[PDB]
Amino acid sequence: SQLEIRDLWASIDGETILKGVNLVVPKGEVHALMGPNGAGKSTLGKILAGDPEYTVERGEILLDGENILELSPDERARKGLFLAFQYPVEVPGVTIANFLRLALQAKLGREVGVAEFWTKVKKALELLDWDESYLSRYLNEGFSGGEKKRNEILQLLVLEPTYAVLDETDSGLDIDALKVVARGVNAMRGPNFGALVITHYQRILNYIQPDKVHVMMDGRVVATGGPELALELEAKGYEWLKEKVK
Ligand SMILES: Nc1ncnc2c1ncn2[C@@H]1O[C@H](COP(=O)(O)OP(=O)(O)O)[C@@H](O)[C@H]1O
Ligand SMILES: [Mg+2]
Ligand SMILES: [Mg+2]
Numbered sequence: 001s002q003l004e005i006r007d008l009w010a011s012i013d014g015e016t017i018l019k020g021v022n023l024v025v026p027k028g029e030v031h032a033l034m035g036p037n038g039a040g041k042s043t044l045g046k047i048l049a050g051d052p053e054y055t056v057e058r059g060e061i062l063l064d065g066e067n068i069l070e071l072s073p074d075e076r077a078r079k080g081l082f083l084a085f086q087y088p089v090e091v092p093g094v095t096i097a098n099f100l101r102l103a104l105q106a107k108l109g110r111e112v113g114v115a116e117f118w119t120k121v122k123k124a125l126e127l128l129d130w131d132e133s134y135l136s137r138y139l140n141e142g143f144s145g146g147e148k149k150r151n152e153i154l155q156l157l158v159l160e161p162t163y164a165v166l167d168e169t170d171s172g173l174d175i176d177a178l179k180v181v182a183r184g185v186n187a188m189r190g191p192n193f194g195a196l197v198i199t200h201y202q203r204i205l206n207y208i209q210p211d212k213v214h215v216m217m218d219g220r221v222v223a224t225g226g227p228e229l230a231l232e233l234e235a236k237g238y239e240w241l242k243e244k245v246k
Pocket of ligand 2: 003035036037038039040042174182
C-alpha cells in the first residue's frame with residue numbers, strides 16, 4: 001500500500017551519494033521531493049529505475065511490501081513501477097500510436113489488439129484533453145525535450161502504472177513542459193496510484209498540489225511538510241532551509 005525508500009545508502013565510484021534516504025509515498029497520494037541540486041534527488045530517481053552504474057550499500061526500496069532493488073527495470077515495471085519505454089530519437093517513420101502499442105505490449109507481456117489499444121488510448125486522450133490526430137505524428141519529429149515529456153505522459157496514462165517517479169528538474173521553469181506533466185499526474189490521481197514528483201523549483205507544485213513535500217540535502221531527507229514547505233523554500237531559498245534544520 002506504499003512505495004517506501006528505507007535507510008537507502010548508495011554510491012558510485014566509492015563516493016557515497018545517498019546517505020540514508022527515508023521516504024514513504026502512500027498509494028493514493030502524490031508527493032514532491034525537492035533539493036538544491038547535487039543533494040541526490042535525481043540519483044534517487046535513477047536508483048529507483050535500476051541504473052546499474054550505482055551500488056546500493058544499505059537499505060531497501062519496497063513497493064507494496066516487496067523489496068525491488070534486486071529486480072531488473074523490466075521486473076520492477078511488472079510490479080507496477082512506471083518505466084517509460086526508450087527508443088532511439090533518430091529513428092524515423094514511427095507513429096506515436098505504433099510506439100505506444102509497442103510499449104503497452106512490452107509491459108503487459110502479450111499482444112494487444114486494436115480495440116484494447118484504442119480504447120485505452122482514447123480514455124487517455126479524454127483525460128488529457130488531446131486530439132486523436134496527435135497519435136498520427138511521428139515519434140521524435142521535432143527532437144525536443146518538450147515532445148519527449150508529452151509522449152511519456154501519454155505512456156503514463158496508457159500503461160497505468162501503480163507508482164510513478166517523475167523527475168522534472170530538467171524542465172526548469174519551462175511552463176508548458178511542467179503543465180503537461182501536471183495534467184498527466186492529476187489525471188492519474190486515485191486510490192490505486194501514488195507518485196513522487198522530483199523538482200528543484202516549486203513551480204510545478206502550483207499545478208500538481210502535493211500531499212507531502214520531502215527536501216533532500218547532503219544525500220538524505222532533512223525536512224518534510226505540506227505544500228507550504230515548498231512555498232517557503234521557493235521564497236527564501238535552499239540556503240535558508242539548510243540552516244533552519246540545524
Ligand atoms: N558518474 C558519477 N560519478 C561520481 N559521482 C557522481 C556521478 N554522477 C553524480 N555524482 C555525484 O552525485 C551528486 C548528486 O547527483 P544528482 O542526483 O544528479 O543531484 P540532484 O538531482 O539532487 O541535483 C553529484 O553532485 C556528484 O557529486
Ligand atoms: Mg538535489
Ligand atoms: Mg537534479
